[PDB]
């Protein structure tokens, strides 16, 4: 249903944010 | 330093988003 | 512009989250 | 009800992410 589609999109964006945070950590360390 | 602190704040937000995704998915499955 | 590029990606992600919140609220009101 | 409460939590998280994106851009420019 529409709710499941939205939840899946939220999880995907959360994972993208984790990947960006990792990149920031990598840049911060050097 | 400041970038690492920012990355940790981003990770904290991403964790809260994922928690919301599990909650929305449970509502969808219920 | 490595940090500026990441900041732009973070802003875009936030706007996608805001669109999802709007869609969830629209589903709630339906 | 619940969906609206969850949507508001998501909107609040998105706004916090925007503040973090702003802070990253500010750090990058100075």
Short mmCIF file of C-alpha atoms in Angstrom, two decimals:
data_model
loop_
_atom_site.label_atom_id
_atom_site.label_comp_id
_atom_site.label_asym_id
_atom_site.label_seq_id
_atom_site.Cartn_x
_atom_site.Cartn_y
_atom_site.Cartn_z
CA UNK A 1 0.00 0.00 0.00
CA UNK A 2 0.97 3.66 -0.06
CA UNK A 3 2.20 3.60 3.54
CA UNK A 4 4.60 0.74 2.87
CA UNK A 5 5.97 2.60 -0.15
CA UNK A 6 6.56 5.69 1.99
CA UNK A 7 8.27 3.69 4.75
CA UNK A 8 10.59 2.10 2.20
CA UNK A 9 11.45 5.54 0.85
CA UNK A 10 12.22 6.78 4.35
CA UNK A 11 14.53 3.84 5.04
CA UNK A 12 16.34 4.46 1.76
CA UNK A 13 16.88 8.12 2.62
CA UNK A 14 18.10 7.22 6.12
CA UNK A 15 20.68 4.92 4.54
CA UNK A 16 21.76 7.63 2.09
CA UNK A 17 22.21 10.00 5.03
CA UNK A 18 24.41 7.40 6.77
CA UNK A 19 26.54 7.17 3.62
CA UNK A 20 26.91 10.95 3.50
CA UNK A 21 27.81 11.06 7.20
CA UNK A 22 30.49 8.46 6.54
CA UNK A 23 31.89 10.61 3.74
CA UNK A 24 31.97 13.60 6.08
CA UNK A 25 33.78 11.50 8.69
CA UNK A 26 36.24 10.39 6.04
CA UNK A 27 36.89 14.00 5.02
CA UNK A 28 37.19 15.12 8.64
CA UNK A 29 39.90 12.55 9.31
CA UNK A 30 41.84 13.46 6.15
CA UNK B 1 37.10 18.44 15.19
CA UNK B 2 34.05 20.39 14.05
CA UNK B 3 33.44 18.26 10.95
CA UNK B 4 33.59 15.03 12.96
CA UNK B 5 31.13 16.46 15.47
CA UNK B 6 28.80 17.37 12.60
CA UNK B 7 29.10 13.88 11.13
CA UNK B 8 28.11 12.37 14.48
CA UNK B 9 25.03 14.62 14.62
CA UNK B 10 24.10 13.46 11.10
CA UNK B 11 24.44 9.83 12.18
CA UNK B 12 22.20 10.50 15.18
CA UNK B 13 19.54 11.97 12.88
CA UNK B 14 19.82 9.05 10.45
CA UNK B 15 19.23 6.64 13.33
CA UNK B 16 16.08 8.52 14.32
CA UNK B 17 14.85 8.44 10.72
CA UNK B 18 15.38 4.68 10.48
CA UNK B 19 13.45 4.23 13.73
CA UNK B 20 10.54 6.12 12.17
CA UNK B 21 10.74 3.89 9.08
CA UNK B 22 10.40 0.74 11.19
CA UNK B 23 7.44 2.35 12.97
CA UNK B 24 5.71 3.37 9.73
CA UNK B 25 6.30 -0.10 8.30
CA UNK B 26 4.72 -1.68 11.39
CA UNK B 27 1.67 0.54 10.93
CA UNK B 28 1.55 -0.49 7.28
CA UNK B 29 1.75 -4.18 8.20
CA UNK B 30 -0.89 -3.81 10.92
CA UNK C 1 34.19 22.19 -3.07
CA UNK C 2 33.97 18.77 -1.41
CA UNK C 3 32.25 19.98 1.77
CA UNK C 4 29.95 22.35 -0.14
CA UNK C 5 28.89 19.47 -2.39
CA UNK C 6 28.06 17.32 0.64
CA UNK C 7 26.14 20.17 2.24
CA UNK C 8 24.11 20.52 -0.96
CA UNK C 9 23.35 16.80 -0.93
CA UNK C 10 22.27 17.03 2.72
CA UNK C 11 19.92 19.94 1.91
CA UNK C 12 18.42 17.99 -1.00
CA UNK C 13 17.90 14.97 1.27
CA UNK C 14 16.15 17.15 3.83
CA UNK C 15 13.81 18.48 1.14
CA UNK C 16 12.97 14.91 0.10
CA UNK C 17 12.21 14.07 3.74
CA UNK C 18 9.93 17.10 3.93
CA UNK C 19 8.05 15.97 0.83
CA UNK C 20 7.63 12.54 2.44
CA UNK C 21 6.33 14.10 5.66
CA UNK C 22 3.82 16.08 3.60
CA UNK C 23 2.67 12.90 1.84
CA UNK C 24 2.31 11.07 5.15
CA UNK C 25 0.20 13.92 6.54
CA UNK C 26 -1.93 13.86 3.37
CA UNK C 27 -2.50 10.13 3.89
CA UNK C 28 -3.39 10.79 7.53
CA UNK C 29 -6.01 13.38 6.56
CA UNK C 30 -7.54 11.08 3.93
CA UNK D 1 -3.85 10.28 14.68
CA UNK D 2 -0.69 8.18 14.69
CA UNK D 3 0.29 8.88 11.09
CA UNK D 4 0.00 12.62 11.70
CA UNK D 5 2.16 12.35 14.84
CA UNK D 6 4.78 10.41 12.87
CA UNK D 7 4.66 12.92 10.01
CA UNK D 8 5.38 15.77 12.45
CA UNK D 9 8.33 13.86 13.89
CA UNK D 10 9.68 13.40 10.36
CA UNK D 11 9.22 17.08 9.52
CA UNK D 12 11.09 18.05 12.70
CA UNK D 13 13.96 15.71 11.80
CA UNK D 14 14.10 17.20 8.28
CA UNK D 15 14.39 20.69 9.72
CA UNK D 16 17.20 19.58 12.02
CA UNK D 17 18.95 18.13 8.97
CA UNK D 18 18.58 21.50 7.20
CA UNK D 19 20.25 23.21 10.15
CA UNK D 20 23.13 20.72 9.89
CA UNK D 21 23.42 21.29 6.12
CA UNK D 22 23.64 25.01 6.82
CA UNK D 23 26.35 24.42 9.39
CA UNK D 24 28.37 22.30 6.96
CA UNK D 25 28.12 24.99 4.28
CA UNK D 26 29.17 27.60 6.87
CA UNK D 27 32.20 25.53 7.87
CA UNK D 28 33.11 25.00 4.21
CA UNK D 29 33.03 28.71 3.39
CA UNK D 30 35.21 29.67 6.36
#
